[PDB]
Amino acid sequence: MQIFVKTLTGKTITLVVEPSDTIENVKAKIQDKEGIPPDQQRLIFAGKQLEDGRTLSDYNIQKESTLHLVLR
Ligand SMILES: [Zn+2]
Ligand SMILES: [Zn+2]
Numbered sequence: 001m002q003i004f005v006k007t008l009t010g011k012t013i014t015l016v017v018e019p020s021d022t023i024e025n026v027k028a029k030i031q032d033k034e035g036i037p038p039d040q041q042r043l044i045f046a047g048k049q050l051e052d053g054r055t056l057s058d059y060n061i062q063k064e065s066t067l068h069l070v071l072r
Contacts, residue, residue, distance in 0.1 A: 003056070004066045005030055005043070017056060024052040030069070042070045 005013040005026070013033045015026065027038035043050040045059050045067045061067070 001063050003061060004064070006066060006068050007034065007036075008069050008071070019057040020055050022053055022055055023050045026056075026067075027052065036069070040072055042072050043067050044070055 001017050001019065003015050003017055003026075005015060007013065011034075013030060015029050015033075017026065017029075023043060024038070026043070027041045030036055030041055031038055038052075045061050045065060048059060050059060050067070
C-alpha cells in the first residue's frame with residue numbers, strides 16, 4: 001500500500017504504509033523524507049483534519065490516496 005503526501009509547495013512524497021499505520025507514523029516518514037519536524041506537520045485527507053493517534057484505516061485512506069500537508 002502506498003499513499004502520496006503533497007507538501008506545501010506541491011512536491012509529492014510517495015510513502016509505503018499499512019492500513020494500521022498511525023498518522024504519527026506517517027509524520028515520522030515525512031520527517032525522514034523532507035526534514036519537516038512532526039510538530040510542524042498538519043495533514044488532511046478528503047477535507048478531514050488527521051490526528052496523530054488515529055490510523056489510515058480509521059480515515060478510510062486507501063491505496064493511492066493523496067494527503068496534503070497544510071498550514072500549522
Ligand atoms: Zn505490519
Ligand atoms: Zn508502519
